[PDB]
Each structure stands twice: as structure tokens, then as C-alpha cells.
Symmetry: C3
């Protein structure tokens, strides 16, 4: 069997919260080294990649590698029945027929379990390439989320301009324009060689920031001509990365 | 006249909150010994019974027994204009023509009063029978409400299974299934002779738990073949009971 | 140029919150002595008057008087991107072509700016007359807002009756009636010579109380036959006044 006990169960609730708007169904790939999901959003625009490593769980067993096709709407609904304090265990027989979620409240007197039916999915097989980035900005996840919420009241698209000493996000539309200038030092840190300037759909960034509760930092990785990576580290465990192509 | 002063006015606000979704109009029966309501829900599915005893009020007068036909939507709207801290008095001349609600804030400088027109209702005359229960579970009202909210994401119907040492609530539907196991000891206490297992519409239980703020305990009384009683004691005053038939 | 720095930026956010439901576009008249707006609501029912005096700003410059036609929906949206803690500056070149709002967070590491296009408006030219009031009631803005919210559940119209020692607000409708009696002393103070009794659309009062966060006091000025003035002082700076004709 597969069995992953997570004492900080809320990590899972939050991971589902951060994917349900983007993806209806995907493979969770289970292996010795942990849990891996890679999928395109349901409109084929961004690509989402999730890593939850073994070590990050309180107990972790995997006897055979599995590819469980999970309906994320369903998993999300079920994770909403877990309390924020609960210990959450994922468990599946190796035939990968159903997935169990078990929620045990800390006062060990209530225990919930849900079994969700798994699907077989034919999934578009994709490989994320080797990529160098001219530019990596690391900033509080809260700020980034507010910038994206704010500019979306102004237009559809944000232009991100990155220099050695600061980053600027701008948009414009019917009502006029806006920008927000952030300076290098919560901490803001820029590592760049080339300066970049790219443009992105605020709609997708707004979905990405559903991940905000997973981490108090977000990292933006950019380079001329290649997708932006918006990464949230799930402390001591892995990351959730979103990939989005610049507009032209 | 009829006059009931309630210093903890919020009890009334909460009682209306716990009935408005279930019942549009009903008789409040006023007598010496207190206030009594018995009515079927507006779809003829569950039966609601309310007791507010004399002693429970700070002052209580009743000179003639009354049967006031009250529109509960109306009474609810008006009770929403009372502050949570207010002293609330119900008052009616014995002709039962209108009902007054008076709300006096504790800083005795603001006083509100509303008069609502009363109706004459022809009401379906019902008698609740003598019943023994194989099984009575007493548990925190909050938990019960969360169980009902949670399982309703899974299916329509909850199967309640009761043993000497614990109770289990299960449901299933399109997305898979769920159950929650609660153990006997907030305190959970089971008094049973026969074990029972019955099934109920989560829709009605969900309405019943609108009563949750009235008490931190709820009591479930069950027996093969007869309606479940979901009871909330209104401390030092009476109870609100809901009755619901098991499905088959 | 025109430039007004406001360290307590939230005053502006709140002023827009208190006008956006009432008015789509209006002239902000800029002069040496401060900022002035006067406009009818978009249905031609009430008149709104705003004063923000020079002295009230931390820095204030005006080199030429301006009449900026501002879309208030737009200004409102943009002011929603300011944090409550931010320092807000209004700035316009004297040609009055666009208006800039600059939001600098207190940790001087983030700075936002928005430019909104200005319009030329042909506006209905009105003069508010000299008026004496029989009656002026000063009361907590919170209470007034609750009275208006509450009575609107009862009817459309509130009858305000004012005596030397107290004020009463009443309404009635389908469900029955209500009144709230407030006594002269939070503080309630009546200055009257003639007693008045007038009736007003609760719809407009409800819009007016969108101003509640600007001040913890509201002042009602009344007189037979003339509009009511609902005034909110914006401490150390000016006022927002709404004018509304009694019904007959
Ligand atoms: N045809 C595919 C989607 O339906 C296109 C696609 C493939 C890949 I691999 C993508 O992911 C990445 C990730 C990092 C990169 O540098 C480039 C593409 C994306 I966004 C879209
Ligand atoms: N930190 C300094 C004030 O103490 C001045 C300052 C402020 C900001 I915001 C900065 O950041 C940016 C970022 C992007 C821009 O386009 C302009 C300034 C810099 I560099 C210096
Ligand atoms: N025909 C009636 C409803 O329209 C049926 C009815 C009558 C009674 I009295 C009920 O109440 C109880 C209460 C306790 C019991 O043991 C049995 C019925 C119910 I639920 C439905
Ligand atoms: N309390 C013990 C752990 O310290 C073990 C335990 C846990 C639960 I939840 C229990 O309750 C139930 C209730 C219903 C069931 O169907 C199964 C266990 C029992 I009995 C013992
Ligand atoms: N025809 C105008 C509106 O479209 C009517 C109008 C004019 C004025 I000046 C008003 O304002 C006041 C303000 C104070 C007063 O004593 C009288 C009118 C109002 I309310 C409506
Ligand atoms: N303050 C006194 C109780 O300590 C009694 C009291 C209460 C109220 I409310 C009052 O106010 C009103 C206001 C309007 C009315 O129509 C009647 C009473 C007065 I004058 C005295």
C-alpha cells in the first residue's frame, strides 16, 4: 500500500485550495521519494507542478509506484471536511482503485474517513525543460497577491520590469493606469544578470496566488522568451510551481 | 395582558433564527406556565416543538391563555433589529390583535418597539405520542453541526449507527463515501439498550442545526421505527425539539 | 500643479466609499483653500456637498484653481488599491488632463501610482441657499446607521419627530410598525426651538450612512419645509453633508 501521514494536515487542504480552480483532474504520481503532480490547467494555458517529498511526511509508505487519477474538485470538497488542526493520512491499496483520506482530530475521539473513487486518465504527456533564468525575484507572497489583485482592477495584463535594485508591475485599461514599484531590501531580493521586462495575464497570476497560504515568500523566475515560474515553497517538503508564458 | 420580559433577549433572536427556515407561520400558545409552539415544517416533513417556561423569564404575566398566529418570517425580521445585548419584552393585549416586541438597550437611553399584526390560522391539529427510545446520544452541538455540514458534501442521507461505546455517521454519493466515528467520553455520552441504525435526510438535519447557538449540547434520541428527536435545551427555560422520520 | 499629501490616507478611501453609490461623476473643485465637491446624486434626489480644507492636508499646493471632472466609480476602484495605512497624495498638472493618486506604504519600500483620465462635465449649476434650522440633533453615527438599517426592514419611509428632550424615528409597512425612541443625554444632544416632525426615504438615508466611518458623530439639521441635512465632520478637515427633501 500507499500511506502518507501528515501531522500538519492543513498543508494538504491548502494545496488543494491552490489547485482546484486551475485543474479538474490530474495524476498524483506516488513513489518512494514522494508525491508528484504535473498538469496543464484546464484551459491549456499554465502548467502546474507539485512536489511533496517523503521526508516531509510524518510517516510515509509506498510499496509500488502508483498513478492515481484524482478528481480535484472531489478531493477539494473532501479536504474541506478536515479541521485545520487535524492529522491527515492518505492511503491507497496498490491496485489504485480508491483513495482514502483519514482525518483524525488531535483529541483522539473523533475520526473521519472518506474514500473517493479514482479514475484512469489519458494524459497529455509533457516534459518540463532545463531552463536558466536572467532574473529571480523573491518577495513576500502577500504583497505579490495584493499587487495582482490591485492591478487587475486596472487592466488584464501586468508588465513586470526587473532591474538590479527593484521591480515594477504596471497595467492599464479603460480607467487609466497603474504601477507599483518595489525596491530591493518583509524582504525583497533580486538576483539578476540580464534585466527583463515581460507581460502576463493577470487572470492566471490571480489563480496562482491561491497558493499564498502555503508560504510567506514567493519566488518569480524570469527570462526573455520563456515561461515565468511562480514558485511557493512548502517548507520542509517541496514546492508548488506555476508556469506561464509571457504574452505577445 | 400577556407580557414576558427576557433579560437575555438574544435567546429569542436565536430561537427565531432556528425556526425561520423551517416554518412560515405558527401558533404561539401562551399560558400561565409559559410559551409553547408546535408546528410542522412548511413541507410537512419534520415537526418542531418549542418550550419556553414562565420561570425562565425575568417577568412573566399571562391573564388569559392566547393562541397568537405569528408570521415567523416577520417576527424574525423584527428580532433582527434587536441588539444582542438588548432586554426584550413580548407584550399582547388579551384580544390577541397585535404582538409587540420591545427592545431596550442596557444604557436605558434607546428603546425600540415593533408591533406586528397577528393572524388567525387554521392549524392541522397534531398530537405528539408517548415514545421510549432505544438510544440517546448527547454530544457537543458544534460537532453535530459540523458532521451534518460535512457529510452533506458527500450525499443526501446520513446513516447513524449507534453502539454502547460509540456512534458513526456515514453517507455516500457520486463522489465516494464518508464516515465519522465518535467515541464515548467536549463530552460524548451514549445511553442505549438496543443498538440502532437509522437513515435521515441531511437537508432536515441541516435545518435543525440552525438551533446550534441555543446550547452547547445536542441530544439525539432514537429508536427503531419512530422519528429521531434532535433536542437543544435552552438552559433554565425549556427546549427546542425537532422530530424527523427515518427514511425507507 | 495641484498636490495634496494626506498622511491619514484612509480619509480619502472612506470619502470615496461614501459617495460612489450616490454619484457616478462630479467636479472636484480645487483651490487654495482646499477641495470642494457639490453634486446631485445620480437620480436627482439628494444633494451631496464635500469640504476638504488645505490645513487638513500634510502638504497642500494649488497653483491655479481647477475643476477636475472625475469618474467616481473609477476613483473608488483605484482608492481600493490603497492600504489603510498608506500615505496618499493627489497630484495633477494645472491643465487638468489626468489625476494621479500615489500610495506609499509607511515602510518606504513599496510605492504605487495610478493615473486616471479626467473628463470635462457640463454640470447643472446649483446654489445651496442660506437656511436656519428649527432643530439640530447630534448623535452617534453608528446608532443613526442602525436605526436606518433597522426601520428599513419595516417600511420605506421614516418619520423623524423631534422634541426638546428626545427624538423618535418610526416607520410602517406590510409587516407592522416600528419605532425607536432616543433620549437626550454615546452622547445625544438636541438643540431646538420649534419641534419638528418630517418624513424621509430610508433608501437615501441608507446611502448617506455609507459616510459612517468618517466620524463617530452625525448631525441632523431639520426644519419644517426644507431639506434635512445629514452632516459627518471629517475631523480637522471639513465635512460631508447630504441634503434630502422631506416627502409629501
Ligand atoms: N502544448 C502544450 C500545452 O497544451 C504547451 C506547453 C508545454 C510545456 I513542457 C509548458 O511548460 C513549460 C515549463 C517551463 C518552460 O521553460 C517551458 C514550458 C507550457 I507553460 C506549455
Ligand atoms: N528606498 C529608498 C527610500 O528610502 C528609495 C527607493 C524607493 C523605491 I519603491 C525603489 O524601487 C523602485 C523599483 C522600481 C522602479 O521602477 C523605481 C523604483 C528604489 I530602486 C529606491
Ligand atoms: N400527517 C402528519 C404531518 O403532515 C404526520 C406526522 C404526525 C406527527 I404527531 C409527527 O410527529 C411525531 C413525533 C414523535 C413521534 O414518535 C412520532 C411522530 C410527525 I415527524 C409527522
Ligand atoms: N478512544 C480510543 C483511542 O484513545 C480508541 C477509540 C476511538 C474511537 I473514534 C472509538 O469510537 C468508534 C465509534 C464508532 C465506530 O464505528 C468505531 C469506533 C472507540 I469505541 C475507541
Ligand atoms: N432641480 C434641482 C435638482 O435636480 C433641485 C434641488 C436644488 C437644490 I440648491 C437642492 O439643495 C438644497 C440644499 C439645501 C436647501 O435648503 C435646499 C435645497 C436640492 I435637495 C434639490
Ligand atoms: N432616561 C429615562 C430613563 O432613565 C427615561 C427616558 C427614556 C427615553 I428613550 C426618553 O426619550 C424619548 C424620546 C422620544 C419619545 O417619543 C419618547 C421618549 C426620555 I425624553 C426619557
Amino acid at each position: 500500500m500507499f500511506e502518507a501521514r501528515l501531522v500538519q494536515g492543513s498543508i494538504l487542504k491548502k494545496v488543494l485550495e491552490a489547485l482546484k480552480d486551475l485543474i479538474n483532474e490530474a495524476c498524483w504520481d506516488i513513489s518512494s521519494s514522494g508525491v508528484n503532480l504535473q498538469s496543464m490547467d484546464s484551459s491549456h494555458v499554465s502548467l502546474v507542478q507539485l512536489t511533496l517529498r517523503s521526508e516531509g511526511f510524518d510517516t510515509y509508505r509506498c510499496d509500488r509506484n502508483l498513478a492515481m487519477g484524482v478528481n480535484l474538485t472531489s478531493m477539494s470538497k473532501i479536504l474541506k471536511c478536515a479541521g485545520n488542526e487535524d492529522i491527515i493520512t492518505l492511503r491507497a491499496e496498490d491496485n489504485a482503485d480508491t483513495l482514502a483520506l483519514v482525518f483524525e482530530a488531535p483529541n483522539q475521539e473523533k475520526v473521519s474517513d472518506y474514500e473517493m473513487k479514482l479514475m484512469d486518465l489519458d494524459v497529455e504527456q509533457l516534459g518540463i525543460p532545463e531552463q536558466e533564468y536572467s532574473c529571480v525575484v523573491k518577495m513576500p507572497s502577500g504583497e505579490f497577491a495584493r499587487i495582482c489583485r490591485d492591478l487587475s482592477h486596472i487592466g488584464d495584463a501586468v508588465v513586470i520590469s526587473c532591474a538590479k535594485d527593484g521591480v515594477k508591475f504596471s497595467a492599464s485599461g479603460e480607467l487609466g493606469n497603474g504601477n507599483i514599484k518595489l525596491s530591493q531590501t518583509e524582504a525583497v531580493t533580486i538576483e539578476m544578470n540580464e534585466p527583463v521586462q515581460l507581460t502576463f495575464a493577470l487572470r492566471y497570476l490571480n489563480f496562482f496566488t491561491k497558493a499564498t497560504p502555503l508560504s510567506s515568500t514567493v519566488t518569480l523566475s524570469m527570462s526573455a522568451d520563456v515561461p515565468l515560474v511562480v514558485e511557493y515553497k512548502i517548507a520542509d517538503m517541496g514546492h508548488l510551481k506555476y508556469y506561464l508564458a509571457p504574452k505577445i
